């Protein structure tokens, strides 16, 4: 009774990391075999539990959080990490139990002309709480003068684009990431 990760993540486009997607997948076993329909190899690891304990264990709910980030940012998707992805886009709790899956998606998510669709948050007044999502687009006030909704000196639009191109080095190529949380 395998969770159909290969079906739900067979998608033309993934969520941007600031707008990370959550899917609830119910009454299923979370199994790595199905990922190979997604990609020929992947990062797959778990915090607080070994992947082996998932064998034959059906969960009442599996919450799968998905998004695209640079390859060299996959390291920020872990408890206790710091940086603009962990702090301002997608935050795991210090005591997180669950799993992280990532695969290179350069062939789907990069474009010779630049894929501007994938955005990330670069500026925020405070860090996200664990599993918080911020999709606001207020101008970020970096000084004491009000921005009045216009970017400019000390006034930043808060998101930036990854502009993925297939000739980027692997570290700046897009990776599809899926984070699993479990409810027995």
């Amino acid at each position, epitope marked *: 009774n395998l969770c159909p990760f290969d079906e739900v993540f067979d998608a033309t486009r993934f969520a941007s990391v600031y707008a990370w997607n959550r899917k609830r997948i119910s009454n299923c076993v979370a199994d790595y075999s199905v990922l190979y329909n997604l990609a020929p*190899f992947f*990062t797959f690891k*778990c915090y607080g539990v*070994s992947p082996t304990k998932l064998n034959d264990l059906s969960f009442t709910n599996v919450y799968a959080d998905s998004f695209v980030i640079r390859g060299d940012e*996959v*390291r920020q998707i872990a408890p206790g990490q710091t940086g603009n992805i962990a702090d301002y886009n997608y935050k795991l709790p210090d005591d997180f139990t669950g799993c992280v899956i*990532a695969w290179n998606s350069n062939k789907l998510d990069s474009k010779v002309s630049g894929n501007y669709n994938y955005l990330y948050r670069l500026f925020r007044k405070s860090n996200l709480k664990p599993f918080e999502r911020d999709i606001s687009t207020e101008i970020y006030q970096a000084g004491n003068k009000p921005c009045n909704g216009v970017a400019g000196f000390n006034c930043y639009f808060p998101l930036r684009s990854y502009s993925f191109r297939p000739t980027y080095g*692997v570290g700046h190529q897009p990776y599809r990431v899926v984070v699993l949380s479990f409810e027995l």
Partner: nanobody, 127 residues
Framework: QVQLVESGGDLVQSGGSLKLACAVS????????IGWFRQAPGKEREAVSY????????YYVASVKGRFTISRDNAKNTAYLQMNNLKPEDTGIYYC????????????????????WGQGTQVTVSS
């Protein structure tokens, strides 16, 4: 926070042996899984061996199976890579990596998964 420092790299003749060390500071080694990786000139960093936290499994890539052995010393908060019957193809900068995670046997070889890295130690094997 986590600091890793590799040592033991050297120039050695083909067929010889070398033992590398990865000294961990700031955290207890038992709570971290450890990976060894190597980077040849012109190539991407590639996996060598994996030692899971908490006395879990150890894994090796096919090209070093039976020649290399990963190990840990809890007294010294250090992990090791013993390398026997070295070959010119083993030349490169060797890095240790650390993560609190439990990796799947098929999920650890990509270096982008790993959050903590040392600065590397150079191994040169002359034909």
């Amino acid at each position: 926070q986590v600091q890793l420092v590799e040592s033991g790299g050297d120039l050695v003749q083909s067929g010889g042996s070398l033992k590398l060390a990865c000294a961990v500071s700031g955290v207890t080694l038992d709570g971290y899984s450890i990976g060894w990786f190597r980077q040849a000139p012109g190539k991407e960093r590639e996996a060598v061996s994996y030692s899971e936290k908490s006395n879990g499994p150890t894994y090796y890539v096919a090209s070093v199976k039976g020649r290399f052995t990963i190990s840990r010393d809890n007294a010294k908060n250090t992990a090791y890579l013993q390398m026997n019957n070295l070959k010119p193809e083993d030349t490169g900068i060797y890095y240790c990596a650390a993560d609190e995670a439990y990796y799947h046997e098929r999920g650890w070889q990509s270096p982008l998964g790993w959050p903590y890295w040392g600065q590397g130690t150079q191994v040169t094997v002359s034909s």
